[PDB]
Amino acid sequence: MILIADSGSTKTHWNVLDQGRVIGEIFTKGMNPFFQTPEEMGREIERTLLPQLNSNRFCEVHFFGAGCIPEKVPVVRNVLKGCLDVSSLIEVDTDMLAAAKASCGRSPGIVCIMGTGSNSCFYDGEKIAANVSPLGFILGDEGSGAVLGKLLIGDLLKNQMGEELKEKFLRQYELTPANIIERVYRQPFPNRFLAGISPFLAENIEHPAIHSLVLNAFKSFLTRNVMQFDYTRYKAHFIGSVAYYYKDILEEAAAATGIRTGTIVRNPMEGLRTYYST
Amino acid sequence: MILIADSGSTKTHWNVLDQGRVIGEIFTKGMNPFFQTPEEMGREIERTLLPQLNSNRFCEVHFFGAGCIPEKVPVVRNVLKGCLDVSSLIEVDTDMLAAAKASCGRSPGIVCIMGTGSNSCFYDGEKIAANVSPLGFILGDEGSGAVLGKLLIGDLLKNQMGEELKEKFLRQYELTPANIIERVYRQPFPNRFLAGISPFLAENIEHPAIHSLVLNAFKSFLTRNVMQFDYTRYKAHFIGSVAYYYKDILEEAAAATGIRTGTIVRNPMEGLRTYYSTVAKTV
């Protein structure tokens, strides 16, 4: 049996494959080693992963997660080693490489993540050969859920979208300006708060201000990130909730900027299953 | 004697006026009642204001500071009353009112602050009648020192401005990306860190991409804040370090958007002195 994980901001998605079949699909909390200690990760595995596994024993583990850079790989691997009995290999790498394997397989492409955060890289068919550091929801992460949320809230409360959308938004999420400021500046994981109010955009996509905010945000991600790669030579592939929920707009953004899209999918898990059983 | 104060994020600027003459000039830390307790404020005053005064007796005190919303007015007043011996009025109001009195006196006008943060309002000649909530360095505060810094760092690290400026910046400030990320996302007062590195812009304003970052930041401020008021009728006055150090580009931004500018000054102290000496002199 093999265990596969893609760990993002809000969640870790796990699949168990055996004899090329899916025999388990599991959500846990996100497991980013910058935000939690090994002890916390190990306890989270024990609490919420193990109860949905049919064994502690795996041939292979492939764990892909935000924040799993070379510095942090050993730490994560030792947690996985301590919790599971792995006979052969324990791969730990980034969510970016998950998306690349999922979307490109063994051939090159430009690969982007558009979820709570965003990211972009060039995958040479084996590994990530180049990348644009995302920089997070304040400084960067163009086109991300948290950035979309940031932009939306700023425009709403600044009376740039009119009174209808502003009041609809505040009433829908039962927010006040004061609540929002508190959340965004003085409460943990503002990026997750902002990404969680971002679905308003998809719900209201037919309104001009809403369409423009998304289109402009996407064009910004493309010009600032994807266009640093050789985008006239390679397809650009997109993985994540935002790539999927705003697919038509992403395609409009790509056509406006000259980018050639490949795969646009919700998450890398479907790709990885194909990757590991073919 | 009268005591005047303008409290901002980085510092509180104090003046002592004696019969229209400036006889004392003092900096302390900023005294935003949302960021410190009344006890912490009182101690800061005893530790840093009182030793710079040769007297604590005043006829009037006018304290203007960020965070001094009506709800916090008596909290602040009582802190000052404790420390200072005052015979007439202790007025406590917002830094926005300081800027307004400083630039407008008794006349109406659009009043803007551009420092570490930014803010805009319509002053009717007596008080702030309307305001655009600035929203902080993440959501808004367009054209502020914090947002200029945010724009600069994102552009530099995302290779938008070339290697030269990128290297020059990291070198000058002894920074590395992972260090910046730490300061911006995981450490206290990221806005102050971002404002603190924004001077790089003034220093390199001859660079076309730096000039352009600042122009577009400023245009964003004007379109998103100032233009919600009756800008085709009233002058927009600008008070702050950013207004001052980037005056020419602010003037350029205003010409481009159709805003008629009024006062552009470093800080409101010069204005408040005139205010209290002339146009609003107690007789």
Numbering used by the authors:
A (entry chain A): 2 to 279
B (entry chain B): 2 to 284
The study reports:
Unlike other bacteria, the pathogenic Tannerella forsythia, a member of the red complex group of bacteria associated with the late stages of periodontitis, lacks biosynthetic pathways for MurNAc production and therefore obtains MurNAc from the environment. Sugar kinases play a crucial role in the MurNAc recycling process, activating the sugar molecules by phosphorylation. MurK and K1058 are two sugar kinases of the cell wall recycling system of T. forsythia, sharing a sequence identity of 44% and separated by a single PGN-scavenging operon within the genome. Structural and sequence data showed that MurK and K1058 both belong to the group of ribonuclease H-like kinases and are members of the ASKHA (acetate and sugar kinase/hsc70/actin) superfamily.
We obtained triclinic crystals for MurK (termed MurKapo), which contain four protomers in the asymmetric unit (ASU) that form two biological dimers. A detailed Cα-RMSD analysis of all four chains in MurKapo showed that both protomers of a dimer possess a virtually identical conformation that is slightly different to the second dimer of the ASU. The dimerization interface of the apo enzyme buries a surface of around 1160 Å2 and involves just two residues (F34 and F35) of the N-terminal domain, whereas all other contacts to the adjacent protomer were made by several locations on the α-helical insertion of the C-terminal domain. These include residues in the helices α4-α9 and the loop region in between β8 and α4, as well as residues in the loop region α10 to β9. Soaking experiments with MurKapo crystals using MurNAc failed, probably due to a rearrangement of the N-terminal domain upon substrate uptake ultimately leading to severe crystal damage. The induced fit of MurK can be visualized by superposing the C-terminal domain of the unliganded MurKapo (“open” conformation) to its corresponding C-terminal domain of MurK/MurNAc (“closed” conformation). The best fit utilizes residue range 106 to 266 and results in a Cα-RMSD value of 0.67 Å for 152 aligned residues, showing virtually identical backbone conformation of all the aligned residues of that domain. In the open state, the adjacent protomer does not contribute to the neighboring active site, but the induced fit accompanying the MurNAc uptake enhances the reshaping of the active site by rigidifying the dimeric interface with additional contacts from the N-terminal protomer.
